[PDB]
């Protein structure tokens, strides 16, 4: 497959990297890093985390353009 969005943040998951995780509720998630996996496990919202692109998206820093190149 081709490039995908992270489903925790809004990072570029290129097709050679990251981790896919499938829940029992039949939902799936990419994860650019283990760092974000950990966060997910914890239940720390990405709207807290300034490293995340959803934070940047919702507090306006023009991060959506670099996520579509």
């Amino acid at each position: 497959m081709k490039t995908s969005l992270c489903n925790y943040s809004e990072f570029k998951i290129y097709p050679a990297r990251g981790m896919k995780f499938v829940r029992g509720d039949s939902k799936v998630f990419h994860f650019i890093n283990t760092k974000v996996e950990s966060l997910f496990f914890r239940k720390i919202n990405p709207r807290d985390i300034r490293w995340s692109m959803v934070y940047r998206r919702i507090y306006k820093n023009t991060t959506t353009d670099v996520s579509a190149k």
């Binding site: 497959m1 081709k2 509720d25 039949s26 939902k27 799936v28």
Partner: protein, 224 residues
Amino acid sequence: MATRLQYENSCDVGVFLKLTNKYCLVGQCGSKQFLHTVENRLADHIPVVETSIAGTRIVGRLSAGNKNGLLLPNTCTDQELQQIRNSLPDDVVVQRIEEKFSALGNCIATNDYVALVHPDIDRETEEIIADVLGVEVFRQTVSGNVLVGTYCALTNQGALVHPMTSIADQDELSSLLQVPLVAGTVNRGNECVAAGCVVNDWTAIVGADTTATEISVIESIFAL
């Protein structure tokens, strides 16, 4: 009419081949005899794609469709999709559906005017499906089961259900779909109707173990 085929000597050929009112999807995982034989019997008119969906052997019950729309899973590859698009002439909406909480084949049985579903499926997804196929989707399930595309095999003129289905349920189904039902089961080792066969209003590809008597019944129901 009923034609006995087997995909790598497996009697469950309904999961490796999709038959619809128009168009046909065929799986490929090194099954050379099957690919050519399905071209020799459709209607010398209905084309074939010979293309995997989600890189998987299953195709017949990973996708659902009629002639006015086609449903694909969220995990389907773009390249694969392109091929499908190419192979299906412009009279149909080839839409990759955004439903990942259930499959687009085991959980959906459909014909050209009505459809069947999970009673579980999200609302938005259902709506999308309705828009695509151009048919009345309504929430109903066969007894003892929540999957319908596993245990029901619908066409326009006829339809099947699994042999444990109660009479009342069957009646209800008939009322809803406006399609004549029958409790006969292909193979007779398998409970599923969708596993052993996919069907069409003109033709029917069926499992190898399926009995001579059994095939007659199915033929009758669809009026082949």
